[PDB]
Structure 1
Amino acid sequence: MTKTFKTLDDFLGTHFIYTYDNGWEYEWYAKNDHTVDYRIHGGMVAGRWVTDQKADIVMLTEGIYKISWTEPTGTDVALDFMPNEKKLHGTIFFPKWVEEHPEITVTYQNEHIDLMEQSREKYATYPKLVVPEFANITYMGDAGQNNEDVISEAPYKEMPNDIRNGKYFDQNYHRLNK
């Protein structure tokens, strides 16, 4: 039933939920050509969420897309989306301090950039926690680009279900609860 992803435009504006093979559940939105929003539902930093993260986004080859970014925490990320196979592979390179004090980062990051930057200078950076994992995509929605509703509140337990069940977004892909 799903459209074939063939171009950059096909990919930009798409809203994903996926589960890594380590059990971590992420939600991620290609908000525009150089911007990503995301929200973390399961894993070491579940509850953490992020908007307006600058990123490099490329189509590597027809229907396969690579996203690269570095965070206020000092974390590096390389994601490879294969939407036509409902698969992804992500490598996250966490500073030592995120592994040892993950709770610091479990917040709306945008409200606490200074805390992220003070923590990354106060605590240990090495050795890195490197997490390279395949994931299965469990949801894709066409949000359009620059849709500020997609990722605009903290995650709650039922949210992935509500989104997948069509209970979260209205006909214009805006929040029913807002």
Structure 2
Amino acid sequence: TKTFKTLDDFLGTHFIYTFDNGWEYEWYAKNDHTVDYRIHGGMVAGRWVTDQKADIVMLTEGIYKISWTEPTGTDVALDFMPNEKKLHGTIFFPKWVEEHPEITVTYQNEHIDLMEQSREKYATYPKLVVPEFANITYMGDAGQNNEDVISEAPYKEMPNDIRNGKYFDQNYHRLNK
């Protein structure tokens, strides 16, 4: 297992992680300012997002912090500690996302206007704040700017397919896309 020391070590890494409640999330550091993600379990299982702009920094050797805000109004602060196979995420959900999470369950890129309309129409407060650790179960070196990594909706056995080496080819690409 490789040791993460620099920002470059972190960028291009594709993660799957599990929270204490069993929910499985998936996230990819596509480049130094862009993230893709995909949700496999829980409140927003089925949601996936590409080309989300984010602030990505190294806090200190091997520790990385990512900050972004969403078309839905959700704020996210993620901290990766990959050398310890640990993540800490804080999600600040607007009230409406807690009330109607299914609205956000889609390929967001095709429904940006709907997210923006919803965040103005429905309630923002009180926010649901979710600060939780997760255990990282998969770390793949996808390289940077790999558009295949998160390129379709999640399906039931997808995380297993990824971990078992059945999803990506030798170059971290999809044979059929």
Tell me, in whole angstroms, the C-alpha distance in 1 between the residues paired with 2:75 and 2:162: 28
Once the two structures are superposed, what CA deviation does each residue of 1:42-61 show, in whole Å capped at 9, x if it has no partner? Answer: 11000000000000000000
Deviation at 1:126, TM superposition (A): 0.2
CA contact (8 A) 1:16 1:28 kept: yes
* 1:20 Cα offset (Å): 1.4
Q: Deviations over 1:124-171 (max 9, x none)?
A: 000000000000000000000000000000000010000000000001
**1:129 corresponds to 2:128:** yes
Over the aligned positions, Cα root-mean-square deviation in angstroms equals 0.6
Match of 2:117 in 1: 118
Deviations 1:52-80 (A, max 9, x none): 00000000000000000000000000000
Residue 3 of structure 1 corresponds to 2
Deviations 1:16-35 (A, max 9, x none): 00011232211000000000
Kindly, what percent of the aligned residue pairs are identical? 99
Residue matched to 1:52:
51
Aligned residues: 177
CA apart distance, 1:176: 2.7
- State the alpha-carbon separation in 1 of the partners of residues 4 and 52 from structure 2: 23
Q: Does the 8 A contact of 1:38 with 1:50 survive in 2?
A: yes
Partner Cα separation in structure 1 for residue 16 and residue 7 of structure 2: 19
Aligned equivalents of 1:117 and 1:99: distance in 2?
16
Unaligned segments of structure 1, at least 5 residues: none
Which residue matches 1:99? 98
Given that residues 22 and 133 in structure 1 are in contact (C-alpha distance below 8 angstroms), is that contact kept between their aligned partners in structure 2? no
Q: Secondary structure at the match of 1:67?
A: strand
Secondary structure of 2:161's match?
A: helix
- Give the match's secondary structure for 1:171: coil
* Distance in 1 of aligned mates of 2:24 and 2:72: 20
Q: Secondary structure at the match of 1:23?
A: coil
| CA drift at 1:177 | 3.2
Runs of 4+ residues deviating >3 angstroms: none
How many Å apart are 1:173 and its aligned residue? 0.3
- 2:6 & 2:124 partners in 1: Cα distance? 38
- Do the aligned partners of 1:86 and 1:138 also contact (CA within 8 Å) in 2? yes
Task: Tell me the TM-score normalized by structure 1.
Answer: 0.98
How far apart, in 2, do the equivalents of 1:50 and 1:116 lie?
Answer: 12
8 Å Cα contact 1:36/1:52 also seen in 2: yes
Distance in 2, matches of 1:67 and 1:22, equals 23
Unaligned runs of 5+ in 2: none
Give, in whole Å, the separation in 1 of the partners of 2:8 and 2:100: 38
Question: Is the CA contact 1:76–1:94 (under 8 Å) kept in the aligned structure 2?
Answer: yes
Instruction: Please identify, of 107-116 and 168-177, the stretch whose mean Cα deviation from structure 2 is larger.
Output: 168-177
